[PDB]
Every structure is written in C-alpha cells, then in structure tokens.
Design a protein around this nucleic acid. Structure first.
Ligand code: MG
Ligand code: ZN
Ligand code: ZN
Lengths: 107, 1270
DNA sequence: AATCGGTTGTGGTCAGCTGCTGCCACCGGTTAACCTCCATTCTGCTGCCAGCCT
DNA sequence: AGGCTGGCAGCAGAATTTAACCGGTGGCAGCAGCTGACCACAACCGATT
C-alpha cells in the first residue's frame, strides 16, 4: 500500500475569534497607481517596499524613506567593447567610417 | 455572489474571464519555474508552490517560524510575507502568470466551428497562419491619405518603371554594339557558316534572357502596385518579401502584424452592432450559400452582442495558475516523489515567458523573437488542451501529458468519475449464498462484516453498558474482538435496515433494503425470491452492502425500498417475487392429478359403498401418512375452512355468506387442499394444476385485492411448500431418462435421399450454387421439425425432462430437442446457415467435425452477449438524460385531450375478438370521455382507471374504442400530472405527486437489453431500437405516399420508379431512385400499377422514416408510429413494457418547433426552440401588432434533445464537455439548478420524491388529547 | 506546636544570541586552429468543379 | 463574353558530443562567552491560631 505525505502539518486547535494579537495596517502603492493593504503585527517594523499582488514592488505610502539607489548593470555592450578597445582606436575607426560615408555620398 | 459556499445557491453562471478577472482572483504572480528545494524539500519563493502566494504549508505558522500560534491569526510576517492561517487555503488560492506577449485561447480558435473565425470572418486556415506567425494581416489602412496621394504615387511608379525600361534600352544598345562587332569579326574571317550563327544565337539568347529579367522585374513592380491599390483590413500577406517591399515603399497608410496581438487589434477595431445589422440584412434579403453562412455567423455575433460579453476575452494577457494541492507533489514511502503533470505544463509556460522577456530586453532580431512568441503560444495551448493542435507533448516513455481539459472530459473525467458517482464509507461486499430459511424482509449478514460496518454504534454501546471506560478502550475492544462485542452487536443491529446492491443496477429493484440478522461464516444469505429482481444466481456472484445513517435515510429504507413492499415489477406490473424453478416443480407436482393413483375415489356399488370419501383433510392426511392415499389421487373431501368457488358458493349458500365453518363437499385431490391452505382465508378454492402462469395469475389477483403484507406472507408460504414437495418429487437426470426417438434413422434417411437428389441436380448443372444451398436449408429445417415432433410424441408426460420444461419452471423444448434428437443446422462466422446439419444429439455425442462446426456459432453468441450488455447500458444512459425532467407535479391538469386506443376489433362473423396487446395499451389508464353504447347510457364514466372489470364491461356492452388520457397530450407546463400518467404499475394505484416517472421509464425500456437479438438489410434487434429513439433515417428506408391518388409502377432498368397522380388534379409526386433489392409492399397482395393509395401509405417494403410521417401526416401519427415500432422489437422476444413508458420518451422528442420565418422577435430561422416559449413570444407579438413567427414541428433524437437543454451543468456532464462549455461561456449562460442531475452534482436534495416542498416541510406534533394524557 | 506566604545561599543549568571563525553551497562569467537546416459509425464542415444564365 | 450555385468528395470530431578555472557572497554550523533567566534543594523568616 502506497502512503504519501504532502509535507505539511495539521494541528488540533479550537479556532477562536476573540483573544487575538493586535495588528496594524500598512498601505503600499505600485508604479501604476494600485494600492494594497497589508496587516502587519503591532510590534513589528514596517518595511519600505513590499512585493504586492501584481508581482511588482510598491513603495510605502508615507513620505519618510530615502532608501532606493542605483544598482546599475556593469555589463552592457559598451562596457564589453571598452574593455578590449581604446578611445583613440575607436575614434580612428569612427573617423575612417565617416570618411568612407563622405566619399560614398559626397565624394 | 457567494464565495465561501454556504448552501443557499440560486444560480451558477458561466462566462468568459478577462484579464482583470484573472488578476483579481490571483493572490500573487508566480515568476519562477521552481517547485521545492532539492535539499530541504521546502517550497521556493516565487515558485509554483510558493507560500507567500498560496498560503502556508503548516497550520498557523509562517515560513521562517517567527509566528506560530492562533494568537497570531491573520497577520502577515514582515520577513517572509506568509500569512499565518490554515494550511487548507492551499486548495483555494490562485495565482497568475503575466505574459510578455498576448496569446489566444485554444478553445475559441481551433475547435469546429471556429468561433474566432466566425466573429472576424477569417477562414481557419487563414487564421492559423496569422496566430502561428506564418503570414501577416492588415490591421488598419488609411483611406483619406491613400485617396489624396494615389496620383503622386502612380507618378512615382511610372517614373521608376521608365528608368527600368531605359536601363533595358541601354542594354539593347550595348548588346547591339557587341553583336555588330561579332558580325564584323565573323563574316570577314573564314569559318563555318553555321558557327558564325551560333555566337549570334547565343547573343540573341542573351537578349531574350535579359529582356526576360526586365519583364519579370516589371511584373514584380506591377504586383506591388496592385497590392497597394487593393489594400484593405483583414487581408493576408504571405510572401514576406512582398510585405517588406510594401512597408519599404508605402510604410505609411497601413499597419500590419502577426500573431495574437494582431488578432486582438482586429477585435479592438470591430463593430459588433454594425456587423450584426449587416448579417441580418443578408439573412433577410439574400439567399443560398450566403444566407446559410450568414446564419451560422450570426449565432456567435448575436451571442456577443445580446450579452454583456466583449470578444476581447478570447485573447489572453494573463494565465491563471491552479492551487498547489490540486496538483500536488507527494513524497512516497522510501523518499520517492510523485508529481502531477500540470507542473510540467506550467513550467514550460514560465520558462518560455521568461526567455521572451530576456530576448525583448536584449533587442534580438525578429526571427528569434517571433520563434519565441510562437513557442510561447504553443506551450499555453498545450497547457489548456494537449494534442488538439499538433502532436501532444509527451513525458517519459512516450506518454502524453494530462492537460487541463483532460481533467474534465470523458468517462474518467471529473463529471463522470467523481461527481455523478463516488466511493462511500459504511460499505461492505461479500459473496451471496442462498438463505431459504429467511423471510422476505430479511438478509443474513456475516458477523465480521457487521462488526466493521456498525463500529461507532457498538463503541457507543460498550461505553454505555460500562464494558469500557472510554472511547479509546472501547475501540480497542472492537479491534481485538472481545467476547462482549457480539452480545452488544446483536443489540445495535436489531431493526436497522441495510441496502443490498448487485451490479449492474439495471432497474430500480437492483437495490433493496433488508433487515439484517447475524450469521456465522463469511457469506451473505439472500432470500430465494429476490434473485429475479437482483438477477443473481449463486455461481460466484457478489453483493454490496450499504448502511443508512440518519433518521430520514432509515425511514426511506424501511418504507420506500423494503423488499416486501416491492413485489410487482414497475415496467409491466407482473409479479417478480414469485415462485420459480424448484418452487414451481414442487407446486406443480403437488397439484397435478394422476388417474388410477392410490386410494382413489371409486363410485362403486353393488357390494360396498364408494370408499374414496373423507370427512376432513386431517383424516386425509392421516390416510396419506399410512400407505393408503396418494397426494395426487382424486378424492372427495369435506371442507369447512376453505371457501367454495363462485358457482358452488352461489348454488349451496344463500344470498351471501359462505361464513367459515359451513361445510361443503369438494371433489379434488389432497394436494390441492394442501395448496389452498396456503392462500388467504377468504380466497376461493382454486382446483387447478399449478403451471407458472396459473401461479402468476393468482399472485396478481392477490396483489390487486389484498394488502401488501398479506401478499408477502403468502409468497413465503408458497416458497416453503414448493421446496418441500420439490425434493419429494422425483426429478433426476440419468442417461435412461434421455430417451431417443425410435424413428430417427428412418426420418434422416428419408431426408438424406432428398438432399442427395438436390446435390446430384447441382452436379448435372441444372441449378446454381446459391439455390442449391436454399434447397438444402429448407430440407433440413423440415427434418429438424419432424425429429422434434417424433421426440415429443415419444416422451411420456411424467419424464423429468418433459416435466421441468412443461411446468414452466425452466427451459424450452428446443433444448430438449438438441439434447435428445438432433442439433440441426448451425451458422457460419458470418451468420448464414451451413448446408450440412448436425445430425447427432448431445446424448449420442457429436463427431469431431460436427463439434468443430458447432463451436463457430457458440463463440459468436458469447461475444455478442458481451457487446449487447455494453450497448444496452449506453442506451439507458441516453434515455435517462433525455427524460429526467418528467416528474409528476400535479394531480389533474384537467385537459380534454387524449389518445384513442384500439380495444378488440370486430370480426365479420360478428363477435368481439379481444386485442392481443390490451394489457400494455388500455389497462392502467384513465378514461378521458364517457363510454356510451349507441349514444345510450354511460358504462364507464370519465376518470376511471380501466381495470379488468371495466374492460369486461366495455366489451360486454360492445364498445370497441375508448379515449384515454396520455402523457403525450398533457397540459401541465413542467412535468406531468398524475391523472394523465395513470396507475403506477408497481403499486397498482394512482401515481404520487413526486414520482420520477422518466427515470422509471428509461430503466423499464433499457433493462430488457441483452435479450434482444437480431434474428435466427433491415435492422431488427437492439440496433433497431437505438435508431428509432435517435430519429435517424433507417437503413432500409421505404418511401411513403404524399397524397391520395393513383400510382404509376414504372419498371425501369432493373429497378423501380413510382409516380403518384393525385385525385385533386395537382402535380404528380415522383419517387425516383428505388433499387430493386427492396420488394413492394403487400396489403390484404402486392402493389400493382394503376392502384389507389392513401396519404400515409408505405409504397415499398422496409422501414418508413419518422421524419416524413411527421411532415406528411402530423404529430399524432408519428406518436402512433414510434410507439408501435419500438414495441414490435420487444414483443418479438416476449417482453412486456406498458406503452406509458415509451410515451414518456416519445413526448420529449416532440417538445420543439423549428423556425421558418423570424417574424419580428429574436428567433433566427432554422433554430429549434421550445413550443411553450414559441407561443409565449407570439401572444406578446400579436399584441402590439400582427407579426408572429412561424414554426413547424421537429422530431429530435435522444442525444440531440438532451444536449439542447437549459442547464449547462447537466449538458456538460452528459457528453461533449468541451463544446458545451465553450459556448455556454460565449452565451454567458446561467443555470437555475432545477434538474435532477444538477442537484446531485452540487450536493442538495433532488426535486423529486421526498425532496419536494410538499413533503419536506411537514410539521409533526402530538395531538391535543395525547399530549395532555401522558 | 503549625501554616501561608517571602528571602535567598548556593549550585547547576540551559538555551539565546553574539561574535566569530572558518567553510561550504550557489551563482555568474570565461574559455579565440577549424567544422553552419528535423477500428467502426455517425455527423457536420469546408473546399472542388461542372453547368446553366446574362 | 464571364459567373455563382448545385451535387460532390474529402476531412475532422465524438461516442462505444566531450568540461573545466575563478571571483565573490550569503548561508551554515559549531563553539566559547557571556549570560540571563530558569530550576531546585535546602535553609531561614513573618505573622498568626
Ligand atoms: Mg452468476
Ligand atoms: Zn515569517
Ligand atoms: Zn395532464
């Protein structure tokens, strides 16, 4: 007889409704103007950004945090070009191509 | 509306989800193709099993374990984001995938008819090329700019063509210069006169090919110009280079694209009202292929118009993701994992979507980007419906993956595997044996099965009697089977019914409720009278046992379906709990009378008195205990406690009153007295010999005239006496009982000479091969009949073989003939007879070649029995689905309509020969008009049940026809009324006001499958019934006449052609292509030329089709035709159904009308609508005007009528689930859950039986006297 | 004499971070002779081509 | 001179070949170095009947 478990637990408690811990509600806003409410615990530090139900990050609605900065890509095609060429070599190549298009169109 | 589903539903509505609906159901976007960690086996963030999206895996914990009780309930952890709540929300929360390119839904593109193609007016081949990136489509064009720059662009094209031709002119000059140089360098030097022309021929070839290059380039330029001048939207451009030339030269003035984003721009620029108006103008004015195509288009255009649906929901911008525990990943024993085939399809969608996002932000060329988009489209198609378009995606082992539409369709889908029938708790099964000591309401339940079924009841009772301290030790006592457990189990099993079921359940008496009593051993003991109902013998059969739990379920098992409350068969009313086989041999032996037997009545005088006369049956029993009397010798008894018959009672006793204790003298046998003491006290003395027909007539009379408890006790007494006198009866088989006829050699020699004569005539060449076979088959059929007759004359009347056949117990005489006698002709693997017979009996022993020939027919019979069982099951399923909404809703619709029944046609000599099928036509029916004689006094008045006394009174008064109420003519809006249906055949009284008479009709028709054989090109068995109920044009279709007139039997080239010249002076009716395989119709002699025919006269011989009887003759004459033709199949096998079970089915085929003119109100022509609402939309229109619709009757099949129903949820579970769901969504249909099948699926009380408001809302209280006096 | 609550001498003790100090999984980028295309049956729809009509 | 409609035939759906460096960072995992509260056996008191 095969016996499998989806790896989780089942607890035997009475689901009450009255003596519950206090909660505070934050409100976030994504870059297309949507708004979401998240119930955090009362004794807990509210984060600056939150991944909402659209799958896009939303910033906290209260104007306090100067947090996000640049995390720029160090790898573009210009960076890969620059690590194997020099400025004078690229300038020579550019000027040779300019002279060829002058000789082609104008002459 | 409701979302938690607390069971007050009014409706279930289906529609077409847009992207805002999808990303409003979702709890988060899944954006990684990850499932669980390979090391810790816990879910991965943003993956397919994510807890931040789908809820936590453990009850009331977060993912990082920071919050871990019900004190923190409903908060979200600020670290991992998991809301701490129950773990069963992972069966309820959906997520979504946000696509990087739009995708079409496969259901609205592919499946015939293409709904996207019908809406946009594109062919499916031209739509596949667009949405799978093989062609372009013009989404828009600009007409003002084109019309104002057409002249300037024409000037530009003429300038460029002038430049091309001037280039060819320059080439003409240059090659002319080279040609003149060739002339000067060839003519002035000595060479061959032909070789000086070869170089100029090559030059002329160069000129021809160069001007051909110029001509082809000019033709390409003309093609570009004509393509731009004839540019319109929805116009495909294959030839990528032609499209590139168009966007190069005239890049303004139009736009184009490939794929589902172009399809969605075409749907954005779509005017539904204007398109519907132009389609309605076409269907009003034009005709032909244009009108038929416009009708088929207007179905889906009007569906999108008349609702609130927008057609933009057929292209996908987001894809919903099913919750994780409906596609689980389970860890087996031994650490192995098993997963659910939808994770692979979802992972393909996420992998290709993420790679497409990478390519778009990388800036890749369009070859790579379009290949990625086409792959994304095919992966979403394989998710929704795998293998519908192309090859299916396979897993390991070349096994196709199981997609989302495979979870719903088929015999193993959701609807039929898990919703309409389930596996149940409190449920056992064992193998049945015979229980001849039981009463009819009892079963023997083995104690080891009863202890497991009744386990909570016995645990409760063990705690209550202080045998156990608590439920844990009581459960241990039951598991270890202590000796107190059996003493308790008797107490808890007393008076608690169980339901016993034997599969397949062909009719409703295949589930019956019995009062169990414990037996030792491991087999169920079934009463020997319920085996005909269950269709059970004891060669290894098994039964299932179910336990009813609540008070209502116990009351239903005790009242509605107790076994002694169901004696009569609900199809014909014949008794089913009747004596059979051994109880028939015993009562036939007991009640037969043997002349010359021991201690007979002598009339003697002269020396001594009579000496056969007994003063009581006690004295006769004492004389039979001595060896002085036989139980089958004719005596004269004096009876005092048995009622005399009607003639003797009338003569001897007075105005009334036999009055028990009054003595009369009977002239009978002692075994007949012993039989008549088992019948009720007031039942008159029978004095007949008990064939099975005689016993069935007695039990029918008892069931009509006495209560149900009296009938059940009487059949148990007959069971006992039959079994006793069966073992004292002397029926055995030896080989000396299988007598052989003493003339068999003479008979077979006399017919062997005739067969030899026919064979020598074939050898001389006088007759062909086939006519020789026909002569031989007729010779050996006569020989088989003569051998059987000589055998029947040879056997004595008290042989055991003859007695078992002749008492009606079992068997028939053709088996006796093949056992002793001659097997006869046997068939081929095809089915034709073989012209050499089997001349040996099985008593003699067949030879090697006779045995090998006999096995062909034996195996074909067994295989056909298997196939017939499957086909009868399929027919019963269709009949249940068509007629499940015919339930009794009323007592009297008070209509004055009815049908005329035939009732003993009148002989020319002058008498009333009774109709042979009058028990299935005119009994059990309510009279509709008063039945008078010569307009005199009424005999049977209106509203009477038409039983045996009424039919006898009508035939004595000389009435051949009555008008009875029928369900074909019922006036009730929903369902039928009880007066029109009439008597319930199982109870013998008028039918109740909640009965599911259509389920009863479907099972009454479909249970006598498997005994409906074709014969020994007209269909004749169960294939004949499946084509009358499906309203097909038959195989051997014979024409019927259209109008009264005279005939023209023209014999054409080797086959007929029939023309009817009407008596009204109208045009002639011509039946053209009639093959001569079918013969002409005979009536009273064959149809000859120059004969007069009636309006419904069948001209050839064969099956008339029902669709033409309805057109020519009317809706009444197709009800007479369809009911009679179904019953001819059943009556040929000796099967009794009442006609009211076929008129319940036939009424559901004629529910509708077909529209032949729209009139003024919303009815597209050619569509079939219900007749009740065809007339509710005509009284609304002959008010406020005079412009009704016109409708003609239709006849439908049982498959076509039950898929065109108002409930999408019961039509999707019948068959064609994908087609039903894909236009219930387009029409935005709503389901009011009125039916019998939609209440089973969603789990509430069916609207029939005890589940209707009349019975369900009964208020019970003690009466005032009984309350205060206790 | 007890009896319900404090004080605590003193000895383990027990896990809860806290550094802390490796150390080990995990993920991204790189590599430069040359060699370039995978059963049967019923029903309905859609496309084919001759055949009269203006 | 062309054209758009009639059978007509074909097709689809549904039922019973090959690997390796290198950087760098976050997670793991184990273990003194405090704890800092916990536990406990035993003994010493604060009135109070
Ligand atoms: Mg059996
Ligand atoms: Zn958490
Ligand atoms: Zn009625």
């Amino acid at each position: 007889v095969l016996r499998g478990s989806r790896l989780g637990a089942v607890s035997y408690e009475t689901d009450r409704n009255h003596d519950l811990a206090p909660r505070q509600i934050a409100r976030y806003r994504t870059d297309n103007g949507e708004e979401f409410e998240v119930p955090f615990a009362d004794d807990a530090e509210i984060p600056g950004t939150w991944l909402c139900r659209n799958g896009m990050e939303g910033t906290l609605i209260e104007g306090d945090l100067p947090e996000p900065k640049k995390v720029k890509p160090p790898r573009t095609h210009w960076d890969m070009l620059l690590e194997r060429r020099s400025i004078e070599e690229l300038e020579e190549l550019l000027k040779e191509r300019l002279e060829l298009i002058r000789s082609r169109r104008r002459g | 509306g409701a979302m938690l589903d607390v069971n007050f539903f009014d409706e279930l509505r289906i529609g077409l989800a847009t992207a805002e609906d999808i990303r409003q159901w979702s709890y988060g976007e899944v954006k990684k193709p990850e499932t669980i960690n390979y090391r810790t086996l816990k879910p991965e963030k943003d993956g397919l099993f994510c807890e931040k999206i789908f809820g936590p895996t453990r009850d009331w914990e977060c993912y990082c374990g920071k919050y871990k009780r019900v004190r923190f309930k409903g908060i979200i952890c600020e670290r991992c984001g998991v809301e701490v709540t129950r773990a069963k929300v992972r069966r309820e929360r959906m997520g979504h995938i946000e696509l990087a390119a739009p995708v079409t839904h496969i259901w609205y593109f592919k499946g015939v008819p293409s709904r996207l193609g019908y809406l946009l007016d594109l062919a499916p081949k031209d739509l596949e090329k667009i949405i799978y990136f093989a062609a372009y489509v013009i989404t828009s064009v600009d007409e003002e700019m084109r019309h104002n720059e057409l002249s300037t662009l024409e000037a530009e094209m003429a300038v460029e063509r002038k430049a091309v031709e001037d280039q060819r002119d320059g080439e003409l000059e240059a090659r002319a210069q080279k040609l003149e140089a060739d002339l000067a360098e060839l003519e002035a030097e000595g060479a061959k006169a032909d070789a000086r022309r070869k170089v100029r021929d090559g030059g002329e070839r160069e000129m021809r090919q160069i001007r051909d290059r110029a001509q082809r380039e000019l033709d390409r330029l003309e093609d570009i110009w004509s393509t731009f001048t004839k540019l319109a939207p929805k116009q495909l451009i294959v030839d990528e280079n032609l499209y590139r030339e168009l966007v190069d030269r005239y890049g303004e003035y139009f736009t184009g694209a490939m794929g589902a984003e172009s399809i969605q721009k075409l749907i954005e620029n779509f005017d539904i009202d204007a398109e519907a108006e132009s389609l309605r103008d076409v269907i009003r004015n034009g005709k032909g292929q244009k009108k038929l195509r416009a009708l088929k288009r207007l179905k889906v255009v009007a569906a999108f118009q008349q609702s609130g649906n927008s057609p933009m929901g057929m292209v996908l911008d987001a894809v919903p993701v099913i919750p994780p525990e409906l596609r689980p990943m389970v860890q087996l024993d031994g650490g192995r994992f098993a997963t659910s085939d939808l994770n692979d399809l979802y992972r393909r969608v996420i992998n290709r979507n993420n790679r497409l996002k990478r390519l778009i932000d990388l800036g890749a060329p369009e070859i790579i980007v379009n290949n990625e988009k086409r792959m994304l489209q095919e992966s979403v198609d394989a998710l929704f419906d795998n293998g519908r378009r192309g090859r299916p995606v396979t897993g390991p082992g070349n096994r196709p993956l199981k997609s989302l539409s495979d979870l719903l369709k088929g015999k193993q889908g959701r609807f039929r595997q898990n919703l309409l029938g389930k596996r149940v708790d409190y449920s056992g099964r064992s193998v049945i044996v015979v229980g001849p000591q039981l009463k009819l309401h009892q079963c023997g339940l083995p104690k080891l099965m009863a202890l497991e079924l009744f386990k909570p009841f016995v645990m409760k009772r063990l705690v209550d009697l202080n045998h156990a301290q608590n439920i844990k030790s009581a459960k241990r006592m039951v598991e270890r089977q202590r000796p107190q457990v059996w003493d308790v189990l008797e107490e808890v099993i007393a008076e608690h019914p169980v339901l016993l079921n034997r599969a397949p359940t062909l009719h409703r008496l295949g589930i019956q409720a019995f009062e169990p009593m414990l037996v030792e051993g491991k087999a169920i003991q079934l009463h020997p009278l319920v085996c005909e109902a269950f269709n059970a013998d004891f060669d290894g059969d098994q039964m299932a046992v179910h336990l009813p739990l609540s008070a209502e379920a116990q009351a239903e098992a005790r009242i509605l379906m107790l076994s002694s409350n169901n004696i009569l068969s609900p199809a014909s009313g014949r008794p089913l709990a009747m004596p059979r086989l051994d109880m028939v041999t015993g009562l036939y032996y007991l009640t037969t009378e043997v002349p010359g037997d021991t201690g007979e009545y002598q009339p003697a005088s002269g020396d001594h008195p009579e000496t056969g006369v007994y003063s009581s049956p006690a004295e006769a029993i004492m004389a039979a205990d001595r060896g002085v009397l036989s139980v089958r010798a004719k005596i004269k008894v004096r009876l005092t406690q048995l009622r005399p018959p009607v003639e003797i009672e009338a003569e001897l006793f007075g105005h009334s009153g036999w009055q028990p204790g009054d003595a009369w003298m009977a002239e009978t046998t002692l075994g007949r007295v012993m039989f008549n003491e088992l019948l009720p006290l007031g039942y008159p003395f029978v004095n007949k010999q008990m064939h099975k027909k005689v016993q069935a007539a007695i039990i029918n009379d008892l069931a009509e005239r006495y209560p149900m408890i009296v009938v059940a006790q009487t059949v148990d007494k007959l069971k006992d006496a039959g079994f006793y006198w069966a073992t004292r009866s002397g029926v055995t088989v030896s080989m000396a009982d299988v007598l052989v006829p003493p003339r068999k050699k003479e008979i077979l020699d006399h017919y062997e000479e005739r067969a030899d004569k026919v064979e020598k005539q074939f050898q001389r060449g006088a007759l062909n091969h086939d006519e020789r076979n026909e002569a031989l088959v007729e010779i050996w059929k006569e020989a088989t009949d003569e051998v059987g007759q000589a055998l029947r004359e040879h056997y004595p009347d008290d042989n055991p073989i003859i007695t078992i056949v002749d008492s009606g117990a079992t068997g028939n005489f053709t088996q006796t003939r093949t056992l002793a006698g001659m097997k006869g002709l046997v068939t081929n693997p095809k089915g034709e007879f073989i012209p050499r017979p089997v001349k040996s009996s099985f008593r003699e022993g067949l030879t090697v070649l006779e045995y090998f020939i006999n096995t062909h027919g034996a195996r074909k019979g067994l295989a056909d029995t298997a196939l017939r069982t499957a086909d009868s099951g399929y027919l019963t399923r269709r009949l249940v689905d068509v007629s499940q909404d015919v339930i009794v809703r009323e007592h009297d619709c008070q209509t004055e309509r009815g049908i005329v029944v035939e009732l003993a046609e009148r002989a020319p000599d002058g008498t009333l020969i009774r109709d042979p099928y009058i028990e299935t036509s005119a009994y059990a029916r309510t009279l509709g008009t008063d039945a008078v004689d010569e307009a005199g006094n009424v005999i049977v008045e209106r509203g009477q049940d038409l039983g045996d006394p009424e039919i006898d009174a009508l035939l004595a008064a000389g009435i051949t026809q009555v008008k009875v109420r029928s369900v074909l003519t019922c006036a009730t809006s929903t369902g039928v009324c009880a007066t029109c249906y009439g008597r319930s055949m199982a109870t013998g009284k008028l039918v109740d006001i909640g009965e599911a008479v259509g389920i009863v009709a479907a099972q009454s028709i479909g249970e006598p499958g498997t005994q409906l054989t074709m014969r020994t090109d007209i269909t004749g068995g169960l294939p004949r019934v499946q084509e009358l109920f499906e309203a097909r044009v038959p195989r051997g279709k014979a024409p019927i006449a259209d109008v009264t007139g005279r005939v023209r039997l023209e014999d054409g080239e080797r086959f007929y052609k029939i023309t009817i010249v009407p008596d009204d002076g109208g045009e002639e009716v011509v039946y053209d292509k009639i093959s001569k395989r079918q013969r002409l119709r005979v009536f009273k002699r064959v149809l000859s030329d120059g004969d007069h025919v009636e309006v419904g006269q069948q001209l050839m011989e064969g099956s008339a089709d029902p669709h033409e009887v309805l057109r020519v003759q009317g809706p009444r004459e197709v009800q007479i035709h369809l009911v009679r033709e179904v019953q001819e199949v059943y009556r040929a096998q000796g099967v009794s159904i009442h006609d009211k079970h076929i008129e319940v089915i036939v009424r559901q085929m004629l529910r509708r009308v077909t529209i032949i003119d729209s009139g003024s109100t919303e009815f597209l022509p050619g569509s079939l609508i219900d007749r009740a609402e065809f007339e509710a939309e005509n009284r609304r229109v002959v008010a406020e005007g005079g412009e009704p619709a016109a409708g003609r009757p239709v006849l439908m099949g049982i498959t076509k009528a039950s898929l065109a129903t108002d409930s999408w949820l019961s039509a999707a579970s019948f068959q064609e689930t994908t087609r039903v769901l894909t236009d219930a969504a387009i029409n935005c249909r709503s389901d009011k859950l009125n039916g019998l099948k939609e209440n089973v699926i969603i789990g509430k009380l069916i609207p029939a039986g005890t589940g209707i408001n009349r019975y369900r809302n009964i208020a019970v209280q003690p009466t005032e006297e009984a309350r205060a006096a206790a």
